[PDB]
Ligand binder design. Structure first.
Ligand SMILES: Cc1ncc(COP(=O)(O)O)c(CNCC(=O)O)c1O
Ligand SMILES: Cc1ncc(COP(=O)(O)O)c(CNCC(=O)O)c1O
Lengths: 414, 409
């Protein structure tokens, strides 16, 4: 237990080597997975702290164990800051993940077998929004809604579904949707059938905090989110709720579905929220939206199609059919050229779910490492180059060579 | 980008918590001090990676190096406990338990677990926990001798026919007869799940009976006596590998915390060393000596002895409640927690006992002599909890101990 002797290299050479290779992989690859980001050294330092040694069951000033004076300060700062970030009436910063945040809401307000509404997985919804192989879909009755012919959210069909099936709770938000979501319209739909509105803003949370994407907080009963992704924090979850749901939400997280919170991660959440309150963060998110638009614009110029026809956020879904390539094949080829994306089903995808006709692209990560409009356009063209000739070794080589020039010029961690 | 520069408030709070861990003798049985190497791992850049799925079977590309990490964690924890399969992704012990429930049960099914009043955990069927709110819970407890009442448990099993039986505890000092519990479960066609969270480190070192050969599922925290990062693990027989893995993902979790899994692997590496078995031998020794010392001073140990890291102290002969004992001891910089004893005459928030554990103090270097001194220091406070002179004298001696035995050097 000497900090000079107990280093990863000294204790575990294998793990040391793996972490080192992952550090270099993060430098040497252009990351375009929309859910990924690079969190600050300050954030990482916090969850590498001795706060992992503390059991702090309960809430600030209301713990089961003693000695929680300082972790109470930590958690309350996290609570106050995330409340300030989104203008929420109350908050819970203990969810271990985005999944647990969502489950926390379900446990608080629902009973197994209740009917819920959520965006279909096939049209950009998340697993925890009602997938039959997820708890949300196996232990509850799920009625899903999707997009219309214009590839915008079909609010009319959702309203008809709400009146027909009378859900106890409506889930909104997405893992792969490029446009602004009309939270006010959804709140009216939910109120019209006496349902709760839960918005999962995990992907947009950073953009919302900077005010470059609509805030669901004034409209929703509950707002759940991850602290990683566009919020650029540590890996974990947060529940935002109206004051009237403070008691059941806090009780649901503990002792409902969790035990001792990860106080070291909560500290990291607090550091991330502090960063998110700065003017620099708003400037970062403005560049996130700009880079995403430029990336989508460039792909359209090269003959690709964007689902919904445009992006109004950090993310886009690219229809690949014009280049006669599957999402799976595109993901692999792009990967060989050191560009990380992920395959993703498009609306009415003619391919199998594990094959798909599209790729999901996001700008938060590349924006964090300093990419601007010019680089975003270059990346778009590099992507198209691979898509038009995915198995040509010479093409992959040329692109990988240019990617190397970008990553050397824009290092992630200095 | 340091915490001090970026977030002065959080930095100061962390520094204060560092000092608090040094300046207090920690006897909360679930607490420990994990190594700098472990902390460094979950402070790594692996927090930047989404790795939904399992090694070699991810949704996303670029998982080559986190795959090496997770598989090292899986292989090492399999080796530590002789398990046929393992899942190292649970975010906590609670999620580890929920993973098993989601895999094998449907809402409304009947389960058996140790009662909370007799040392069981929240996730073993508490009505305000998921385990107890969405399932029908039949609890079993201790007999008159304050050992597990296996006869009553077998009768309850035959009567209520649970689909699953949970064993393990948060506050039980004796060796649990896992083989007996397995026979019971098999007789009624029930699964046996053992939650070994408190004993996992002792079990890895072979100083406490291993439930793995006898149970269908063994869940645990990676913190506590195993001395790793905060998180959970499921160990399971090979025939249940698929439903368990599927239940963790995409069942109840999403992206695993790869930085914490790396920290788990480092902790498992440490637990495989000869130094760890020697550590756990000292853990058992110090707990026994602590219990022995308290008995000489007139206190009583629930179950009459300890065979592990933990003990539940009956405080009634000293005419002090667990609540008062915890408060007075805390003032003297000795951290314990109140705990109800079997047939406790006091209200649940008052109790007639305190739970004590040796893992934390053993980790910072306490031996048999220090364990005995701590026992006497505790008894001094218990016998005069409101005496200012007694609290100060004990605090001064505690200060002498924490200075000679620093947690982090
Ligand atoms: C919208 C949304 N909500 C929750 C999650 C998962 O949270 P986790 O911390 O992984 O339990 C996600 C995750 N999706 C990953 C991705 O889109 O790549 C999500 O999108
Ligand atoms: C036996 C047992 N099982 C699960 C847990 C909690 O896991 P967590 O990571 O907190 O969700 C515990 C926890 N107990 C606290 C204590 O005993 O002090 C446990 O003992």
């Amino acid at each position: 237990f000497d900090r000079a002797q107990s280093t990863i290299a000294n204790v575990d050479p294998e793990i040391f080597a793996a972490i080192e290779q992952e550090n270099r992989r993060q430098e040497d690859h252009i990351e375009l997975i929309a859910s990924e980001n690079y969190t600050s050294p300050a954030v990482m330092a916090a969850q590498g702290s001795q706060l992992t040694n503390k059991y702090a069951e309960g809430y600030p000033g209301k713990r089961y164990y003693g000695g929680c004076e300082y972790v109470d300060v930590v958690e309350q700062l996290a609570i106050d800051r995330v409340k300030q970030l989104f203008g929420a009436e109350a908050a819970n910063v203990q969810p271990n993940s985005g999944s647990q945040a969502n489950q926390g809401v379900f446990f608080a307000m629902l009973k197994p077998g209740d009917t819920i509404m959520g965006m279909s997985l096939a049209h950009g919804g998340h697993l925890t929004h009602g997938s039959p192989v997820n708890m949300s879909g196996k232990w509850f009755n799920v009625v899903s809604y999707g997009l219309n012919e214009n590839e915008d959210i079909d609010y009319d069909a959702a309203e008809k579904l709400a009146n027909e099936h009378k859900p106890k709770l409506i889930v909104a938000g997405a893992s792969a949707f490029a446009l602004k979501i009309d939270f006010e319209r959804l709140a009216k739909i939910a109120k019209s059938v006496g349902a709760y509105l839960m918005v999962d803003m995990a992907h947009y949370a950073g953009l919302i905090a900077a005010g470059v994407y609509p805030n669901p907080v004034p409209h929703a009963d509950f707002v759940t989110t991850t602290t990683h992704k566009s919020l650029r924090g540590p890996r974990g979850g947060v529940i935002l709720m109206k004051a009237e749901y403070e008691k059941p939400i806090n009780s649901a997280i503990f002792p409902g579905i969790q035990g001792g919170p990860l106080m070291h991660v909560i500290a990291a959440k607090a550091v991330a929220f502090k960063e998110a309150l700065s003017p620099e963060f708003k400037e970062y998110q403005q560049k996130v939206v700009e880079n995403a638009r430029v990336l989508a614009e460039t792909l359209v110029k090269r003959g690709l199609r964007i689902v919904s026809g445009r992006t109004e956020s950090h993310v886009m879904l690219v229809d690949l059919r014009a280049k006669h390539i599957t999402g799976k094949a595109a993901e692999a080829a792009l990967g060989a050229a050191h560009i990380t994306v992920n395959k993703n089903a498009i609306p009415n995808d003619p391919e199998k779910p594990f094959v798909t006709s599209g790729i999901r692209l996001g700008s938060p990560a590349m924006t964090t490492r300093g990419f601007g409009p010019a680089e975003a356009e270059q990346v778009g063209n590099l992507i198209a180059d691979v898509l038009e000739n995915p198995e040509d070794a010479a093409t992959i080589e040329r692109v990988r060579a240019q990617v190397a020039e970008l990553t050397k010029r824009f290092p992630v961690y200095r």
